[PDB]
Amino acid sequence: TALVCDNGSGLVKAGFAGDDAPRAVFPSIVGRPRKDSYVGDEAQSKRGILTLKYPIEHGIITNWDDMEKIWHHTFYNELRVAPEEHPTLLTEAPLNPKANREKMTQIMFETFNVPAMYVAIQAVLSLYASGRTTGIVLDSGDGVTHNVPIYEGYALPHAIMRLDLAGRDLTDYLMKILTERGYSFVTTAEREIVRDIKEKLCYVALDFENEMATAASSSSLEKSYELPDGQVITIGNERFRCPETLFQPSFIGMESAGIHETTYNSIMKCDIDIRKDLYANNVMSGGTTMYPGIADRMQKEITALAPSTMKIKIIAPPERKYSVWIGGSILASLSTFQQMWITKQEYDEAGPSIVHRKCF
């Protein structure tokens, strides 16, 4: 039976083709002595005696030796499968470097002995999962944000935009402003608490200015949050100030334009004859797209940027933290997908270069 592994900068999403969700979700981390290693939660718990490392930086695999650990743990610790028994589908970032794709192919065949494998682009899979073959995807996780326009099933490499501002950066920001309010959040253990507050109490404002003013008046935006230690804190304009950074990167001292602009900009880099399709098929994907209010603000933000008669539409599915993984589970499950896999036979004949001709 086919497996699907979706390897993110922050979390690994793993499971079996045909399932409607990933069976295993865990932090993409490898701990070593300051067994000879731990992965995921185990690593985090014994963090005090370990050196922690993230093998994927901004969606790109950057430490091969640590990645094999992740994969091993995935196969043996989480999925409890014998890798040599299952054809395996992996995901990658758009614009993933040539030799990285080759490396992944080599390790699977040479170290794990899979009978077959395949690499697909994360954003494209999201589009598939929403039942579309044409649209532009906004994919934002813990390490990277991209805009990926897609036509009739295939990304358009020239028009893709990458932005190194995402979830981790939002968590760090909420930390700073929250201690600014009088509280104190500096420690890793504290980073963890803020992340939970980031995911529970934050939201995106429809009008950021009014929101600020309305928070300076009454206290109807204010919310209470009980610390692990029992203390209660009161969270204010930070609820909506933290994700504001997605639209105004200047907040964190970034020079890039917000995600509404990078969206408009990717679209305009495409052939004029497809722009309308793009504009009407804006798919949101990944964890950092989960803030309440996010789809309304973007809907507002891009009708302002585009001609007043453009039909515009944002699609933000409740399950979009898993849309990539679900896209893969569907693709690998189809009757017609049989001949798509790269066989061990093909690899032995051609070598790792085969990936460039078998996987777009």
């Binding site: 039942g131 579309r132 073959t133 017609t336």
Partner: protein
């Protein structure tokens, strides 16, 4: 690439209307007597083949999604469409059709008017 599926071998061989339904992750032909009767719990792939005067064949692919179809069905219809296009040397133009919002062209494939019926085949998840 290169697909071996027997329906793939049959698609676009001659002018006409071919209709397949997505059935638990497979492409299954619809009985020709049932054309136009769509289960609103299911998803379908339609191929419309018209004769060109240059002797070559023109193609239009449309995937139709019912209001109550499951995610695996809507996702698979879309992928099958991409695959059918590629197999046809990318010669097809692709169209997305949503229940209650179909295009005038697609609606015209059905001379006696298309019809909606509740139900469908169960999910493949």
């Amino acid at each position: 690439m290169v697909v071996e599926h027997p329906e793939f071998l049959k698609a676009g061989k001659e002018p006409g209307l071919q209709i397949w339904r997505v059935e638990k992750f497979d492409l299954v032909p619809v009985p020709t007597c049932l054309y136009g009767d769509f289960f609103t719990g299911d998803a379908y792939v339609i191929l419309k083949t018209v004769q060109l005067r240059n002797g070559n064949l023109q193609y239009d692919l449309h995937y139709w999604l019912g209001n109550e179809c499951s995610q695996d069905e809507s996702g698979a219809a879309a992928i099958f469409t991409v695959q059918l296009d590629d197999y046809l040397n990318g010669r097809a133009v692709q169209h997305r059709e949503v229940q209650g919002f179909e295009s005038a062209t697609f609606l015209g494939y059905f001379k006696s008017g298309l019809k909606y019926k509740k139900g469908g085949v169960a999910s493949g998840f």
